[PDB]
Design a protein. Structure first.
Lengths: 335, 98, 483, 196, 49, 49
């Protein structure tokens, strides 16, 4: 049988609840069979991290950056921002490139890469016997210099379309006829050629789809970064480390959720015929410790009961005292 | 009958021990496979693989000693080998997350 | 194998070192609050502090680790289980069932009638929530809000006639239910100032009847909150509270315990110990012959602890049976340890190389940081070979660890728990005379404020009477140290 | 062989005697006429163990197996908690998932369009690496300063065990011959039993 | 089912929930009974039932 | 994988479309003459842990 509170009070750090425990006639009640049901909301906070490592690009080398661009200002006699200094990889292979990007198939009519999602960063050549030297055509994606340089390890950018494209929208499209601006993705196409490419032998070989994303590192921090500024060649080699784990949850046996051994916050159990309170409590007593030792005594303390949050605290015995047995490494290992 | 024996022999004894006579080896599953504990991955420290000789490929170098003549320059030293292979910077390495 | 071992050692020891052993990496600005998660996530510990060769071939816990709380770890199975029970997300609506823990009303058989039931609940995140890092959750944006709290109660559908007979028989004066608190000790907290090693305490003259003994352990004021305050504004710690959950980890820091009665007589005296007037818990540097278990603990202290816990010691020493060796017991957690270290004085070729000047695994590890490899392959200068044909002169070190347990000094003539009411508890001199008790402790100094937890074993009983319908009367009695 | 693994698939159990009366009736449960094993989507307040099981079902299972529930809930001693018992295999679980409706910036990216560990893993197959190092679009961060709106899911698993509904007045195994087994109405009268 | 599946959560996969968990090579009893006969495809056996 | 993620690359120069009468490709000059980009997949070695 459930009892709805007859009075409730909220304070700054206390929640006062009052009930009317009515035991019916020809009945008994064991107080050990009674409990409080608490339903509420919890915001654990930004310090919560119930795991080790990173969830994004875990296999990446901790110094490996994405395909990203930086600006080389280098103003000499005049302000000549060189710019478009690029560093990365292009992994998709197409048949040809004319002006519209990477051709990805045919239908006569050649189909071209959709700038919103193509080229997919998750695809590439299928076998190691690529044997590619015959003037191939390759395409990829890159990060515009307007996005902050970050290691690949831990990098996340939210999707902005059903196809997985993470590009933002560039609101700066003011129509010249006094009309409202129009949203569209900030995806641009840059073309590259080889080293000699003197006068006429200028045919593109890599087409990169530069873009801007909502880059963020939600479970890792940078542990090495040379210059406080951003978007420099030196910043390609910043190293990243995962955030420390922090498991946040309710205490064992809900110790602390109820008030004990406080004279100003003392619980009340009284029959209404009188008003005298049968609960007298002192500040020299420890109720929580008494329950802990009791429930140690009456049962085994490695088993877990989810009802009372009955999960003892412990530590790894190999971490408190260190067994340095050495390392069994007689056999060499190779890659 | 089979279920009756199974529950009986559960009741009368412990069911993790194995007896080869009656093929008495209960079926089970890995508790970490039925319910997945995704604790993450303890991978703070980088791990590297290095060339067999420790350092990577090097470069050829010749010994030179200071000039005891009037001009204090650098002449070829001749107790030194013309081709000493020494690597500058750090060695070669590849990264792996074990 | 080397990489797996190094990853284990780093992620489980090096990141948990005290902040004196860490530095702030350059080009990085960290909050001034040392209790913030950002500060702890932004400090860098040199991996070479705890490396693959640390105490090679030895069973030894690190000395800096010895005074650090071991339950503030992500290897805590209970804590990580309780974290996963709520879910993996930062936002969670919860639904929990909380028990009643008061010793007087957690097992009472309530009779028919109408009663008023009332209690208070905390909203402080630093009290209701636990974190493996111990950072201040108040300043890190944790919030808890209660929507509705209900009380559930189940009844045995007993036959009405037998039930009526039960209330009829249970409303008499001789059928009053009686309960006692399991700990049954009066709790006293005493401050230990920083770097202080001597803490003397004084209790004025009072009756000492029904004394079942002492129990004492060390705590940390940063971890232990102020008792009785509806809200403690100086609590900046969200980790384990040993004062409340029993996870004690500083028992080894004691040196000796001295008991004086009436400021003149000594307890127990009567030349019952090798050191008759005090209790030498551990005796380092010395070693004239009064140590046991291949550690630094003294024979008398081991005998006293064994007799107090398992009644063992007068007829030989042996491993107690498991059903007495509970988790919070002594023999379960007693861990002797020993190791060898180089001889500074007698080794003629000794040099004191500092941390930035030690190269081992050089060219394949980073330099003072968990960063990329750098260096040359070169022979190591660290550590000193303690084995082999060219082993160095050595000196042995001994110590012991004893966690989640309380030191106990029982108030009996033979230190054995023959009964709850000790023999000296009903002794004539402690029956009617009044004595003032003086104690003096000796502890290993530490650079943080500490609190000496003292339990005066008493009898804490309550007699609850329900003579008519809807009437409860409870009569309390604490003996001694009465309310 | 007794290796049962689909006990959680039940929703509710209804018992009818003579097509008119309900067992056990007598308003002995929060849901008097049926046995609500689990109650998802709902949650007015009749769930326990931080999972989706109802209070009444937990009480019934505990009383049937270990005679526990009338005088508090506690872990049964091991020599009753055999391998094929209830408390041994009861596993409450809970998790958070992204909020589709309320998260304003939600996109439903399909499997072939999700790249994580891209450039270091294969594409939809346990094959060679292929791709570019690029920031991931999967999954949604449920922690951190930029955590997304979430909705909680609850369920439970209970393997190698049988749900039990005993034929006793107080659901307790006082003896092999149950009290209602020797009851007059079930002694000589004839009844047709309906279940749903 | 990748390294980030329900990161930091205690959760069994929903498709896995209706699949028999004892049909696994982590079955200790089954693999023990397989090794009792031997490692070969052909085996003469001798059992007591 | 290599420390920088991708393996060794190649030198590349930026080029933009021609706005003149001939729609060819001329050297673009907001682009660096030496951009190091790798085509295909990166370098890798295999190991059975």
């Amino acid at each position: 049988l459930r009892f709805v509170p007859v009075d409730r009070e909220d304070n700054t750090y206390s929640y006062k609840v009052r009930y009317t425990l009515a035991v019916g006639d020809n009945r008994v009640l064991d107080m050990a069979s009674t409990f409080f049901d608490i339903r509420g909301v919890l915001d654990r906070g930004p310090s919560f991290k119930p795991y080790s490592g990173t969830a994004y690009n875990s296999l990446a080398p901790k110094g490996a950056p994405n395909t990203s661009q930086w600006i080389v200002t280098t103003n000499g006699d005049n302000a000549v921002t060189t710019t478009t200094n690029t560093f990365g990889i292009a992994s998709m292979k197409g048949d040809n490139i004319t002006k519209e990007g990477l051709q990805i198939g045919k239908d006569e009519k050649p189909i071209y890469a959709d700038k919103t999602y193509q080229p997919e960063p998750q695809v590439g050549e299928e076998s190691w016997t690529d044997t590619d030297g015959t003037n191939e055509k390759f395409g990829g994606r890159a990060l515009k210099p307007a996005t902050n340089m970050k290691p690949c390890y831990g990098s996340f950018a939210r999707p902005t379309n059903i196809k997985g494209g993470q590009a933002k929208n560039r609101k700066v499209k003011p129509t010249t006829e006094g009309g409202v601006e129009t949203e569209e993705p900030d995806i641009d196409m840059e073309f590259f050629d080889g080293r000699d490419a003197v006068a006429g032998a200028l045919a593109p070989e890599i087409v990169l789809y530069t873009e801007n994303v909502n880059l963020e590192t939600p479970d890792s921090h940078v542990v090495y970064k040379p210059e406080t500024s951003n978007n420099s060649h030196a910043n390609l080699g910043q190293q990243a480390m995962p955030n420390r784990p922090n498991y946040i949850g309710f205490r064992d046996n809900f110790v602390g959720l109820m008030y004990y051994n406080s004279t100003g916050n003392m619980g009340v159990l009284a029959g209404q015929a009188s008003q005298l309170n049968a609960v007298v409590d002192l500040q020299d007593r420890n109720t929580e410790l008494s329950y802990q030792l009791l429930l140690d005594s009456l049962g085994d303390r490695t088993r877990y009961f989810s009802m009372w949050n009955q999960a003892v605290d412990s530590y790894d015995p190999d971490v408190r005292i260190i067994e340095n047995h050495g390392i069994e490494d007689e056999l060499p290992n190779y890659c | 009958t089979e279920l009756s024996y199974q529950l009986l022999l559960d009741s009368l004894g412990d069911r993790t021990r194995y007896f080869s006579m009656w093929n008495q080896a209960v079926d089970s599953y890995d508790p970490d496979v039925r319910i997945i504990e995704n604790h993450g991955i303890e991978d703070e420290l980088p791990n590297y693989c290095f060339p067999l000789n420790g350092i990577g490929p090097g470069h050829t170098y010749q010994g030179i000693k200071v000039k005891t003549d009037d001009t204090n320059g650098w002449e070829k030293d001749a107790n030194v080998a013309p081709a000493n292979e020494i690597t500058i910077g750090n060695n070669l390495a590849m990264e792996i997350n074990i | 194998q080397a990489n797996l071992w190094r990853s284990f050692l780093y992620s489980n020891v090096a990141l948990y070192l005290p902040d004196v052993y860490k530095y702030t990496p350059p080009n990085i600005t960290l909050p001034t609050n040392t209790n913030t998660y950002e500060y702890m996530n932004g400090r860098v510990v040199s991996p070479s502090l705890v490396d693959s060769y640390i105490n090679i071939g030895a069973r030894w816990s690190l000395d800096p680790m010895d005074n650090v709380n071991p339950f503030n770890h992500h290897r805590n199975a209970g804590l990580r289980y309780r974290s996963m029970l709520l879910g993996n997300g930062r936002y969670v609506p919860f639904h929990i069932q909380v028990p009643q823990k008061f010793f007087a009303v957690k097992n009472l058989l309530l009779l028919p009638g109408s009663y008023t039931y009332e209690w208070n609940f905390r909203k402080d995140v630093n009290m209701v929530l636990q974190s493996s890092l111990g950072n201040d959750l108040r300043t890190d944006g944790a919030t808890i809000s209660f929507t509705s709290i209900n009380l559930y109660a189940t009844f045995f559908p007993m036959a009405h006639n037998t039930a009526s007979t039960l209330e009829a028989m249970l409303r008499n004066d001789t059928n009053d239910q009686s309960f006692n608190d399991y700990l049954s000790a009066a709790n006293m907290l005493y401050p230990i100032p920083a770097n202080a090693t001597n803490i003397p305490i004084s209790i004025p003259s009072r009756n000492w009847a029904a004394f079942r003994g002492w129990s004492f352990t060390r705590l940390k004021t940063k971890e232990t909150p102020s008792l009785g305050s509806g809200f403690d504004p100086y609590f900046v710690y969200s980790g384990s509270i040993p004062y409340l959950d029993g996870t004690f980890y500083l028992n080894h820091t004691f040196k000796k315990v001295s008991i004086m009665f009436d400021s003149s007589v000594s307890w127990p005296g009567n030349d019952r110990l090798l050191s008759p007037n005090e209790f030498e818990i551990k005796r380092t540097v010395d070693g004239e012959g009064y140590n046991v278990a291949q550690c630094n603990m003294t024979k008398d202290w081991f005998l006293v602890q064994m007799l107090a816990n398992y009644n063992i010691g007068y007829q030989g020493f042996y491993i107690p049976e498991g059903y007495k060796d509970r988790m919070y017991s002594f023999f379960r957690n007693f861990q002797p340890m020993s190791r060898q270290v180089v001889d500074e004085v007698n080794y003629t070729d000794y040099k004191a190389v500092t941390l930035p000047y030690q190269h081992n695994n050089s060219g394949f590890v980073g330099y003072l940081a968990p960063t990329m490899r750098q260096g040359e392959p070169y022979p190591a200068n660290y550590p000193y070979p303690l084995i082999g044909t060219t082993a160095v002169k050595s000196v042995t070190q001994k110590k012991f660890l004893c966690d989640r347990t309380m030191w106990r000094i029982p108030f009996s003539s033979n230190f054995m728990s023959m009964g709850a009411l000790t023999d000296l508890g009903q002794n004539m001199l402690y029956a009617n005379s009044a004595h003032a008790l003086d104690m003096t402790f000796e502890v290993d100094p530490m650079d943080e404020p500490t609190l000496l937890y003292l339990l005066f074993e008493v009898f804490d009983v309550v007699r609850v009477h329900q003579p008519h319908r809807g009437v409860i009367e409870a009569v309390y009695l604490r003996t001694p140290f009465s309310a």
